[PDB]
């Protein structure tokens, strides 16, 4: 029992784009852009759609960089998050109802105001290493179990 999600990181040589989530799941934290994959679209199409809805941006190419499975205690569906990155974006990022975008220098990523799991796998993202992760949460703050490894194929 798992549900497909996307997460998109716009990662340029010296900065990364994050969005401050304004409502809904994860509100009040910076994150990549993404959301649920809909019936009738591929995972990559859903990632492009969420990037556009949340930031106005389109992209030439998205690259698979990771998969993260989340368990939330008491919730029946695992969240199967497909993580993508891109360097070349099209457009200037703009605020949506869901997200307020901002660029961050790579040594100034705001981990204290991000989901606690990002501290663990962001180093792999920045190192351009593909990964599989699993995080079990009690509520929104406490990681109870986790696993993280590098993989050759996402």
């Amino acid at each position: 029992a798992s549900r497909l999600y996307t997460l998109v990181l716009v990662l340029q040589p010296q900065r990364v784009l994050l969005g401050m989530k304004k409502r809904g799941f994860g509100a009040g934290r910076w994150n990549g852009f993404g959301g649920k994959v809909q019936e009738g679209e591929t995972i990559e199409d859903g990632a492009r759609r969420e990037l556009q809805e949340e930031s106005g941006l389109t992209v030439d190419a998205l690259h698979k960089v990771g998969q993260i499975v989340f368990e939330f205690v008491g919730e029946p569906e695992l969240m199967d998050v497909h993580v993508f990155c891109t360097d070349s974006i099209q457009g200037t990022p703009v605020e949506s109802d869901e997200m307020r975008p901002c660029w961050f220098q790579l040594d100034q990523i705001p981990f204290k105001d991000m989901w606690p799991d990002d501290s663990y796998w962001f180093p792999l993202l920045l190192q351009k290493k593909k990964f599989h992760g699993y995080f079990k949460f009690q509520g929104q703050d406490t990681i109870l179990d986790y696993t993280l490894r590098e993989v050759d194929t996402v």
Side-chain angles (χ1 to χ4, degrees), residues 2 4 23 28-29 31-32 34 38 57 60 72 75-76 79 83 87 90 110 115 121 133-134 142 144 146:
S2 62
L4 287 174
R23 57 171 68 164
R29 285 161 166 178
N31 205 352
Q38 292 171 358
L57 300 178
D60 164 83
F72 289 88
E75 298 191 9
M79 295 182 52
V83 185
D87 190 346
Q90 305 157 349
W115 277 93
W121 57 269
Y134 164 72
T142 303
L144 297 178
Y146 81 92

PDB file of all heavy atoms in Angstrom, residues 2 4 23 28-29 31-32 34 38 57 60 72 75-76 79 83 87 90 110 115 121 133-134 142 144 146:
ATOM      1  N   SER A   2       1.096   1.809  -1.182  1.00  0.00           N
ATOM      2  CA  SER A   2       1.907   3.012  -1.304  1.00  0.00           C
ATOM      3  C   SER A   2       1.289   3.913  -2.360  1.00  0.00           C
ATOM      4  O   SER A   2       0.548   3.464  -3.238  1.00  0.00           O
ATOM      5  CB  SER A   2       3.365   2.679  -1.646  1.00  0.00           C
ATOM      6  OG  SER A   2       3.456   2.020  -2.891  1.00  0.00           O
ATOM      7  N   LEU A   4       2.039   7.332  -5.002  1.00  0.00           N
ATOM      8  CA  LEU A   4       3.122   7.979  -5.742  1.00  0.00           C
ATOM      9  C   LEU A   4       3.125   9.486  -5.546  1.00  0.00           C
ATOM     10  O   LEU A   4       2.080  10.143  -5.666  1.00  0.00           O
ATOM     11  CB  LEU A   4       3.005   7.687  -7.232  1.00  0.00           C
ATOM     12  CG  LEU A   4       3.362   6.273  -7.663  1.00  0.00           C
ATOM     13  CD1 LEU A   4       3.050   6.101  -9.159  1.00  0.00           C
ATOM     14  CD2 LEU A   4       4.821   5.992  -7.372  1.00  0.00           C
ATOM     15  N   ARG A  23       0.552  26.140   2.851  1.00  0.00           N
ATOM     16  CA  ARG A  23      -0.675  25.506   3.321  1.00  0.00           C
ATOM     17  C   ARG A  23      -0.519  24.006   3.125  1.00  0.00           C
ATOM     18  O   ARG A  23       0.376  23.545   2.418  1.00  0.00           O
ATOM     19  CB  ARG A  23      -1.898  26.032   2.564  1.00  0.00           C
ATOM     20  CG  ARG A  23      -1.780  25.845   1.062  1.00  0.00           C
ATOM     21  CD  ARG A  23      -3.068  26.162   0.313  1.00  0.00           C
ATOM     22  NE  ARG A  23      -3.423  27.580   0.340  1.00  0.00           N
ATOM     23  CZ  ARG A  23      -4.311  28.137  -0.482  1.00  0.00           C
ATOM     24  NH1 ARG A  23      -4.917  27.393  -1.400  1.00  0.00           N
ATOM     25  NH2 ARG A  23      -4.587  29.433  -0.395  1.00  0.00           N
ATOM     26  N   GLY A  28       4.903  25.562   6.398  1.00  0.00           N
ATOM     27  CA  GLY A  28       5.854  26.174   7.297  1.00  0.00           C
ATOM     28  C   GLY A  28       7.281  25.697   7.147  1.00  0.00           C
ATOM     29  O   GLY A  28       8.148  26.185   7.876  1.00  0.00           O
ATOM     30  N   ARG A  29       7.552  24.763   6.228  1.00  0.00           N
ATOM     31  CA  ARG A  29       8.899  24.285   5.932  1.00  0.00           C
ATOM     32  C   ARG A  29       9.267  24.551   4.479  1.00  0.00           C
ATOM     33  O   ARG A  29       8.420  24.479   3.584  1.00  0.00           O
ATOM     34  CB  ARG A  29       9.035  22.777   6.200  1.00  0.00           C
ATOM     35  CG  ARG A  29       9.104  22.458   7.699  1.00  0.00           C
ATOM     36  CD  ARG A  29       8.779  21.020   8.025  1.00  0.00           C
ATOM     37  NE  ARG A  29       9.185  20.734   9.400  1.00  0.00           N
ATOM     38  CZ  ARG A  29       9.010  19.567  10.006  1.00  0.00           C
ATOM     39  NH1 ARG A  29       8.417  18.572   9.366  1.00  0.00           N
ATOM     40  NH2 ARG A  29       9.420  19.406  11.252  1.00  0.00           N
ATOM     41  N   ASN A  31      10.879  23.199   1.081  1.00  0.00           N
ATOM     42  CA  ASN A  31      11.017  21.881   0.464  1.00  0.00           C
ATOM     43  C   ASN A  31      11.238  22.079  -1.028  1.00  0.00           C
ATOM     44  O   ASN A  31      11.135  23.193  -1.549  1.00  0.00           O
ATOM     45  CB  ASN A  31       9.779  21.008   0.722  1.00  0.00           C
ATOM     46  CG  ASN A  31      10.081  19.506   0.670  1.00  0.00           C
ATOM     47  OD1 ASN A  31      11.176  19.082   0.296  1.00  0.00           O
ATOM     48  ND2 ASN A  31       9.086  18.693   1.043  1.00  0.00           N
ATOM     49  N   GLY A  32      11.554  20.989  -1.709  1.00  0.00           N
ATOM     50  CA  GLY A  32      11.440  20.966  -3.150  1.00  0.00           C
ATOM     51  C   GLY A  32       9.976  21.041  -3.545  1.00  0.00           C
ATOM     52  O   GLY A  32       9.066  21.032  -2.714  1.00  0.00           O
ATOM     53  N   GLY A  34       6.586  19.637  -5.577  1.00  0.00           N
ATOM     54  CA  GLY A  34       6.042  18.337  -5.912  1.00  0.00           C
ATOM     55  C   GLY A  34       4.701  18.099  -5.243  1.00  0.00           C
ATOM     56  O   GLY A  34       4.060  19.016  -4.727  1.00  0.00           O
ATOM     57  N   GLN A  38      -1.016  12.056 -10.391  1.00  0.00           N
ATOM     58  CA  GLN A  38      -2.417  11.855 -10.716  1.00  0.00           C
ATOM     59  C   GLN A  38      -2.597  10.647 -11.630  1.00  0.00           C
ATOM     60  O   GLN A  38      -1.671  10.201 -12.307  1.00  0.00           O
ATOM     61  CB  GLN A  38      -3.000  13.100 -11.391  1.00  0.00           C
ATOM     62  CG  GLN A  38      -3.109  14.326 -10.498  1.00  0.00           C
ATOM     63  CD  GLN A  38      -3.490  15.583 -11.277  1.00  0.00           C
ATOM     64  OE1 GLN A  38      -3.632  15.556 -12.499  1.00  0.00           O
ATOM     65  NE2 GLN A  38      -3.645  16.693 -10.563  1.00  0.00           N
ATOM     66  N   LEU A  57       7.571  27.517 -13.148  1.00  0.00           N
ATOM     67  CA  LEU A  57       8.703  27.104 -13.965  1.00  0.00           C
ATOM     68  C   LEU A  57       8.367  25.901 -14.839  1.00  0.00           C
ATOM     69  O   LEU A  57       7.609  25.007 -14.451  1.00  0.00           O
ATOM     70  CB  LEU A  57       9.906  26.748 -13.084  1.00  0.00           C
ATOM     71  CG  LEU A  57      10.475  27.839 -12.170  1.00  0.00           C
ATOM     72  CD1 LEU A  57      11.625  27.271 -11.340  1.00  0.00           C
ATOM     73  CD2 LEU A  57      10.925  29.029 -12.995  1.00  0.00           C
ATOM     74  N   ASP A  60      13.533  21.798 -19.332  1.00  0.00           N
ATOM     75  CA  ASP A  60      13.856  21.007 -20.514  1.00  0.00           C
ATOM     76  C   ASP A  60      13.918  19.519 -20.179  1.00  0.00           C
ATOM     77  O   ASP A  60      13.269  18.697 -20.838  1.00  0.00           O
ATOM     78  CB  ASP A  60      15.179  21.484 -21.112  1.00  0.00           C
ATOM     79  CG  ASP A  60      15.772  20.488 -22.077  1.00  0.00           C
ATOM     80  OD1 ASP A  60      15.354  20.490 -23.255  1.00  0.00           O
ATOM     81  OD2 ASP A  60      16.658  19.708 -21.653  1.00  0.00           O
ATOM     82  N   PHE A  72       4.276   7.171   7.814  1.00  0.00           N
ATOM     83  CA  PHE A  72       3.805   7.945   8.951  1.00  0.00           C
ATOM     84  C   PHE A  72       2.984   7.012   9.833  1.00  0.00           C
ATOM     85  O   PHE A  72       2.037   6.384   9.356  1.00  0.00           O
ATOM     86  CB  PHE A  72       3.008   9.169   8.489  1.00  0.00           C
ATOM     87  CG  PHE A  72       3.872  10.236   7.865  1.00  0.00           C
ATOM     88  CD1 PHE A  72       4.169  10.218   6.511  1.00  0.00           C
ATOM     89  CD2 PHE A  72       4.437  11.229   8.652  1.00  0.00           C
ATOM     90  CE1 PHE A  72       4.989  11.194   5.956  1.00  0.00           C
ATOM     91  CE2 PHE A  72       5.247  12.202   8.098  1.00  0.00           C
ATOM     92  CZ  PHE A  72       5.527  12.177   6.751  1.00  0.00           C
ATOM     93  N   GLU A  75      -0.808   6.004   9.479  1.00  0.00           N
ATOM     94  CA  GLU A  75      -1.358   6.263   8.148  1.00  0.00           C
ATOM     95  C   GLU A  75      -1.197   5.023   7.282  1.00  0.00           C
ATOM     96  O   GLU A  75      -0.096   4.464   7.224  1.00  0.00           O
ATOM     97  CB  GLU A  75      -0.656   7.447   7.480  1.00  0.00           C
ATOM     98  CG  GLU A  75      -0.800   8.784   8.210  1.00  0.00           C
ATOM     99  CD  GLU A  75      -0.312   9.970   7.377  1.00  0.00           C
ATOM    100  OE1 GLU A  75      -0.016   9.781   6.175  1.00  0.00           O
ATOM    101  OE2 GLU A  75      -0.225  11.095   7.924  1.00  0.00           O
ATOM    102  N   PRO A  76      -2.250   4.567   6.591  1.00  0.00           N
ATOM    103  CA  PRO A  76      -2.147   3.275   5.888  1.00  0.00           C
ATOM    104  C   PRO A  76      -1.213   3.288   4.699  1.00  0.00           C
ATOM    105  O   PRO A  76      -0.520   2.289   4.459  1.00  0.00           O
ATOM    106  CB  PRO A  76      -3.593   3.002   5.456  1.00  0.00           C
ATOM    107  CG  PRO A  76      -4.220   4.367   5.393  1.00  0.00           C
ATOM    108  CD  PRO A  76      -3.623   5.099   6.557  1.00  0.00           C
ATOM    109  N   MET A  79       4.267   6.782   1.508  1.00  0.00           N
ATOM    110  CA  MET A  79       4.497   7.787   0.473  1.00  0.00           C
ATOM    111  C   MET A  79       5.739   7.389  -0.311  1.00  0.00           C
ATOM    112  O   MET A  79       6.839   7.401   0.238  1.00  0.00           O
ATOM    113  CB  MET A  79       4.688   9.180   1.074  1.00  0.00           C
ATOM    114  CG  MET A  79       3.490   9.752   1.785  1.00  0.00           C
ATOM    115  SD  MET A  79       3.888  11.416   2.379  1.00  0.00           S
ATOM    116  CE  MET A  79       4.494  12.156   0.874  1.00  0.00           C
ATOM    117  N   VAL A  83      12.252  11.487  -6.646  1.00  0.00           N
ATOM    118  CA  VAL A  83      12.983  12.743  -6.537  1.00  0.00           C
ATOM    119  C   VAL A  83      13.694  13.003  -7.849  1.00  0.00           C
ATOM    120  O   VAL A  83      14.361  12.113  -8.395  1.00  0.00           O
ATOM    121  CB  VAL A  83      13.993  12.708  -5.372  1.00  0.00           C
ATOM    122  CG1 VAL A  83      14.656  14.082  -5.193  1.00  0.00           C
ATOM    123  CG2 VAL A  83      13.290  12.246  -4.098  1.00  0.00           C
ATOM    124  N   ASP A  87      19.116  21.313 -13.726  1.00  0.00           N
ATOM    125  CA  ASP A  87      19.904  22.539 -13.689  1.00  0.00           C
ATOM    126  C   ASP A  87      19.258  23.644 -14.510  1.00  0.00           C
ATOM    127  O   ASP A  87      18.985  24.727 -13.986  1.00  0.00           O
ATOM    128  CB  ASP A  87      21.333  22.271 -14.184  1.00  0.00           C
ATOM    129  CG  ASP A  87      22.276  23.454 -13.949  1.00  0.00           C
ATOM    130  OD1 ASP A  87      21.803  24.570 -13.645  1.00  0.00           O
ATOM    131  OD2 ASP A  87      23.501  23.265 -14.082  1.00  0.00           O
ATOM    132  N   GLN A  90      13.340  26.965 -17.152  1.00  0.00           N
ATOM    133  CA  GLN A  90      12.782  27.946 -18.066  1.00  0.00           C
ATOM    134  C   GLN A  90      11.843  28.844 -17.275  1.00  0.00           C
ATOM    135  O   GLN A  90      10.881  28.361 -16.666  1.00  0.00           O
ATOM    136  CB  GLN A  90      12.059  27.248 -19.212  1.00  0.00           C
ATOM    137  CG  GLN A  90      12.950  26.266 -19.945  1.00  0.00           C
ATOM    138  CD  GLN A  90      12.151  25.206 -20.676  1.00  0.00           C
ATOM    139  OE1 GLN A  90      10.941  25.084 -20.481  1.00  0.00           O
ATOM    140  NE2 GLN A  90      12.821  24.442 -21.531  1.00  0.00           N
ATOM    141  N   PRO A 110      18.511  25.754   4.515  1.00  0.00           N
ATOM    142  CA  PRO A 110      17.878  25.994   5.838  1.00  0.00           C
ATOM    143  C   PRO A 110      17.309  24.741   6.495  1.00  0.00           C
ATOM    144  O   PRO A 110      16.101  24.619   6.727  1.00  0.00           O
ATOM    145  CB  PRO A 110      16.789  27.013   5.492  1.00  0.00           C
ATOM    146  CG  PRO A 110      16.389  26.645   4.076  1.00  0.00           C
ATOM    147  CD  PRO A 110      17.695  26.268   3.398  1.00  0.00           C
ATOM    148  N   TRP A 115      11.922  19.582   6.363  1.00  0.00           N
ATOM    149  CA  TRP A 115      11.601  18.274   6.911  1.00  0.00           C
ATOM    150  C   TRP A 115      12.872  17.639   7.480  1.00  0.00           C
ATOM    151  O   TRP A 115      13.935  17.706   6.848  1.00  0.00           O
ATOM    152  CB  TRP A 115      10.994  17.366   5.836  1.00  0.00           C
ATOM    153  CG  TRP A 115       9.500  17.562   5.615  1.00  0.00           C
ATOM    154  CD1 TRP A 115       8.900  18.386   4.697  1.00  0.00           C
ATOM    155  CD2 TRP A 115       8.440  16.923   6.334  1.00  0.00           C
ATOM    156  NE1 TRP A 115       7.525  18.288   4.800  1.00  0.00           N
ATOM    157  CE2 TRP A 115       7.221  17.395   5.797  1.00  0.00           C
ATOM    158  CE3 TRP A 115       8.404  15.982   7.369  1.00  0.00           C
ATOM    159  CZ2 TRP A 115       5.979  16.962   6.268  1.00  0.00           C
ATOM    160  CZ3 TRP A 115       7.170  15.552   7.835  1.00  0.00           C
ATOM    161  CH2 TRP A 115       5.977  16.042   7.284  1.00  0.00           C
ATOM    162  N   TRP A 121      19.661  13.012   3.338  1.00  0.00           N
ATOM    163  CA  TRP A 121      19.880  12.675   1.936  1.00  0.00           C
ATOM    164  C   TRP A 121      20.288  13.852   1.061  1.00  0.00           C
ATOM    165  O   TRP A 121      20.766  13.624  -0.049  1.00  0.00           O
ATOM    166  CB  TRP A 121      18.632  12.001   1.323  1.00  0.00           C
ATOM    167  CG  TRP A 121      17.372  12.790   1.396  1.00  0.00           C
ATOM    168  CD1 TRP A 121      16.439  12.769   2.384  1.00  0.00           C
ATOM    169  CD2 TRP A 121      16.897  13.714   0.416  1.00  0.00           C
ATOM    170  NE1 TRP A 121      15.405  13.630   2.081  1.00  0.00           N
ATOM    171  CE2 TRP A 121      15.673  14.227   0.879  1.00  0.00           C
ATOM    172  CE3 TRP A 121      17.400  14.164  -0.797  1.00  0.00           C
ATOM    173  CZ2 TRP A 121      14.934  15.168   0.153  1.00  0.00           C
ATOM    174  CZ3 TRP A 121      16.667  15.094  -1.525  1.00  0.00           C
ATOM    175  CH2 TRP A 121      15.446  15.584  -1.042  1.00  0.00           C
ATOM    176  N   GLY A 133      16.035   5.917  -0.092  1.00  0.00           N
ATOM    177  CA  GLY A 133      15.886   6.200   1.314  1.00  0.00           C
ATOM    178  C   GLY A 133      14.534   5.741   1.817  1.00  0.00           C
ATOM    179  O   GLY A 133      13.586   5.545   1.053  1.00  0.00           O
ATOM    180  N   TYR A 134      14.469   5.560   3.132  1.00  0.00           N
ATOM    181  CA  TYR A 134      13.240   5.178   3.820  1.00  0.00           C
ATOM    182  C   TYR A 134      13.236   5.895   5.155  1.00  0.00           C
ATOM    183  O   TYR A 134      14.240   5.848   5.870  1.00  0.00           O
ATOM    184  CB  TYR A 134      13.154   3.658   4.033  1.00  0.00           C
ATOM    185  CG  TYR A 134      12.110   3.273   5.054  1.00  0.00           C
ATOM    186  CD1 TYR A 134      10.752   3.366   4.764  1.00  0.00           C
ATOM    187  CD2 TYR A 134      12.481   2.871   6.338  1.00  0.00           C
ATOM    188  CE1 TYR A 134       9.789   3.031   5.723  1.00  0.00           C
ATOM    189  CE2 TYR A 134      11.517   2.525   7.294  1.00  0.00           C
ATOM    190  CZ  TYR A 134      10.183   2.614   6.981  1.00  0.00           C
ATOM    191  OH  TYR A 134       9.232   2.274   7.935  1.00  0.00           O
ATOM    192  N   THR A 142       9.631  13.645  14.331  1.00  0.00           N
ATOM    193  CA  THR A 142      10.443  12.599  14.937  1.00  0.00           C
ATOM    194  C   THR A 142      10.662  11.473  13.940  1.00  0.00           C
ATOM    195  O   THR A 142       9.701  10.819  13.517  1.00  0.00           O
ATOM    196  CB  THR A 142       9.772  12.062  16.201  1.00  0.00           C
ATOM    197  OG1 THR A 142       9.546  13.151  17.104  1.00  0.00           O
ATOM    198  CG2 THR A 142      10.663  11.030  16.865  1.00  0.00           C
ATOM    199  N   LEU A 144      11.749   7.866  13.549  1.00  0.00           N
ATOM    200  CA  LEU A 144      11.904   6.693  14.402  1.00  0.00           C
ATOM    201  C   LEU A 144      12.878   5.682  13.809  1.00  0.00           C
ATOM    202  O   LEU A 144      13.755   5.170  14.513  1.00  0.00           O
ATOM    203  CB  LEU A 144      10.546   6.036  14.638  1.00  0.00           C
ATOM    204  CG  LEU A 144       9.461   6.824  15.380  1.00  0.00           C
ATOM    205  CD1 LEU A 144       8.198   5.998  15.452  1.00  0.00           C
ATOM    206  CD2 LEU A 144       9.923   7.224  16.788  1.00  0.00           C
ATOM    207  N   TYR A 146      15.153   4.826   9.962  1.00  0.00           N
ATOM    208  CA  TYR A 146      15.429   5.230   8.588  1.00  0.00           C
ATOM    209  C   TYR A 146      16.500   4.329   7.998  1.00  0.00           C
ATOM    210  O   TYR A 146      17.291   3.710   8.722  1.00  0.00           O
ATOM    211  CB  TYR A 146      15.857   6.705   8.477  1.00  0.00           C
ATOM    212  CG  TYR A 146      17.312   6.995   8.785  1.00  0.00           C
ATOM    213  CD1 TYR A 146      18.260   7.012   7.770  1.00  0.00           C
ATOM    214  CD2 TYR A 146      17.732   7.274  10.081  1.00  0.00           C
ATOM    215  CE1 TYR A 146      19.597   7.271   8.035  1.00  0.00           C
ATOM    216  CE2 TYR A 146      19.068   7.536  10.358  1.00  0.00           C
ATOM    217  CZ  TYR A 146      19.991   7.530   9.323  1.00  0.00           C
ATOM    218  OH  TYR A 146      21.320   7.802   9.568  1.00  0.00           O
TER     219      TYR A 146
END
